Amino acid sequence: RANDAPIVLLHGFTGWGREEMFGFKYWGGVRGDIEQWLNDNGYRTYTLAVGPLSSNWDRACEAYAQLVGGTVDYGAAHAAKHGHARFGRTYPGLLPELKRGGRIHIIAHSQGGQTARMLVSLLENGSQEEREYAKAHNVSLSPLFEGGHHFVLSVTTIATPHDGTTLVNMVDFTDRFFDLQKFVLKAAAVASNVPYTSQVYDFKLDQWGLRRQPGESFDQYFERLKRSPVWTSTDTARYDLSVPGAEKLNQWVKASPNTYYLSFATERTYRGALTGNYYPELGMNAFSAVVCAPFLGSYRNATLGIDDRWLENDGIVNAFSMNGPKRGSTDRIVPYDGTIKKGVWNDMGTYNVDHLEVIGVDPNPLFDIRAFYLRLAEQLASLQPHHHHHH
Ligand SMILES: [Ca+2]
Ligand SMILES: [Zn+2]
């Protein structure tokens, strides 16, 4: 143990707070409670919950406020550009200590990894556009946009589409994506054709002024979201998840030299006998198996750059996209050699588990999830806050 930094957990295009889904955890799912496990083992751990469908930017803003406390500030320039609210939900702050020189490890899953990267970039570099806009229009400016924060010792990504996922190319992606949401609700024993009066799954679309109404089931709510700016505008997860969107995000979201980055790739497919195509293995979550993997494993696009290396997948994301950003990126990626190097992506390899199995939302008895996270935690705790140069 070289550091006492707490661990913070962060979800992707699906996810919810510890008090949502009747307690079914995004981090653990049918297997348990990952956060609890870490805590019980001596690793202080917290959980962030942000908009699942929102843009990484929105998410980052939300994360910052959820960490330090206060009212979400999306940036005047940003809000005016995308025509959504500047200020959002107020949070009590999970870790005030950050504002006193404390540091955290972020463990992110899926799109959460893009969000984590973005958060570190904003914390350290702020946003020039925001600074300049504040100065020309005489509006206040969130600390998040000034730069100079050192809050993050490390970022670990699991099954993150750093270069996007081809899933979004599906002609029917709109319908299937939401079907995936319903699937996850199903996993938690929640029906989508029911108007639960209870919260259940808050998409936190405060900036857009959207929320499930009384008498409105998720099926009906999603129909509405599909036609809303959270689905039709570039300031969305849908955009950032795409290959072009991810590359655009990679053009400015760089690895900080002061933070350690670890990536974990996932794969649950096999290569066909007479084709470079990939197919879903036995055990893969039912949804992905039928609806997503076949596409991910057979889809190519030369103009875009999507070739045979992109076909191996975890049912939702292309494994090629997971070791770290590459398209439009200046970041470096190094295969793990037994030493975790700072300011670069330490590619920890590929694990044989699906997008949902990795977090416990889909079962997989052959995957010792408790040990995986515990080992991870142990590794993060061994990170030195000062690496001495040596032979
Ligand atoms: Ca399984
Ligand atoms: Zn936004």
Assign 3-class secondary structure to 313-334.
Answer: ECCCCEHHHCCCCCCCCCCCEE
Domains of the chain in start order, with CATH, are 7-381 (3.40.50.1820)
What tokens were used for 297? Answer: 């494993």
Q: How far apart are CA 200 and CA 212, in angstroms?
A: 10
User: Would you say how long the chain is, in residues?
Assistant: 391
Nearest to 377 by CA among 50, 154, 162: 154
For the chain, count helices (H), then strands (E): 13, 11
Q: How far apart are CA 243 and CA 318, in angstroms?
A: 11
**CB contact at 8 A, 160 and 264:** no
To 5 degrees, how large is the angle CA 278–CA 282–CA 285?
A: 90
Q: Which ligand does the CA of 79 lie closest to?
A: 2
Q: Which ligand does the CA of 285 lie closest to?
A: 1
Q: How do 87-91 and 70-73 pair as beta strands?
A: antiparallel
Instruction: Say whether 387 is catalytic.
Output: no
Q: What is the resolution of the experimental data for this entry, in Å? A: 1.8
Classify each residue of 77-94 as buried b or exposed e, where b means 16 or more C-beta atoms within 10 Å of its C-beta: bbbeebebebbbeebeeb
Alpha helix positions (H), the chain: 34-40, 56-68, 76-82, 112-125, 128-137, 173-187, 218-226, 229-232, 237-240, 243-250, 286-287, 293-296, 369-381
Q: How far apart are CA 314 and CA 307, in angstroms?
A: 17
Output the furthest CA–CA distance in the chain (Å, rounded).
67
Instruction: Say whether 314 is catalytic.
Output: yes
To 5 degrees, how large is the angle CA 213–CA 219–CA 224?
A: 60
Cα 357 to averaged position of ligand 1 atoms, centre (Å): 6
What amino acid is encoded at 13 in this protein?
F
Helix/strand/coil for 63: helix
Cα 168 to averaged position of ligand 1 atoms, centre (Å): 23
DSSP state for residue 301 in the 8-state scheme: B
Helix/strand/coil for 336: coil
Task: Report the DSSP beta bridge partners of residue 107.
Answer: 9, 156
Nearest to 33 by CA among 12, 1, 9: 9
Instruction: Say whether 355 is catalytic.
Output: yes
Q: How far apart are CA 272 and CA 381, in angstroms?
A: 41
Q: How far apart are CA 280 and CA 224, in angstroms?
A: 32
Computed over its alpha carbons, how large is the radius of gyration of the chain?
20
Which of 163, 314, 331, 347 is an active site residue?
Answer: 314
Q: Which residues contact 58 (CB under 8 A, 6 or more apart)?
A: 50, 51, 74, 207, 235
Task: Compute CA distances 265 → 125, 139, 162, 232, whole Å.
Answer: 28, 42, 11, 29
Nearest to 116 by CA among 53, 50, 30, 40: 50
Task: Compute CA distances 85 → 114, 135, 146, 226, whole Å.
Answer: 22, 20, 20, 19
| Residue 19 burial class via C-beta count within 10 angstroms: exposed 0-12, middle 13-18, buried 19 and up | exposed
Cα 316 to averaged position of ligand 2 atoms, centre (Å): 24
**CB contact at 8 A, 173 and 226:** no
Say which experimental method was used.
X-ray
Question: Among all chains, which residue has been given the structure tokens 């670990």?
Answer: 156
What tokens were used for 86? Answer: 């500047």
Q: How far apart are CA 242 and CA 179, in angstroms?
A: 18
**CB contact at 8 A, 376 and 34:** no
What amino acid is encoded at 307 in this protein?
D
Classify each residue of 348-379 as buried b or exposed e, where b means 16 or more C-beta atoms within 10 Å of its C-beta: beebebbbbbbbbbbbbeebebbebbbebbeb
Integer distance in angstroms from the first to the last C-alpha of the chain? 23
Which of 82, 109, 149, 355 is an active site residue?
Answer: 355
Q: How far apart are CA 56 and CA 63, in angstroms?
A: 10
Cα 74 to averaged position of ligand 2 atoms, centre (Å): 6
Task: Report the DSSP beta bridge partners of residue 306.
Answer: 301
Q: How far apart are CA 288 and CA 33, in angstroms?
A: 23
| Residue 125 burial class via C-beta count within 10 angstroms: exposed 0-12, middle 13-18, buried 19 and up | middle
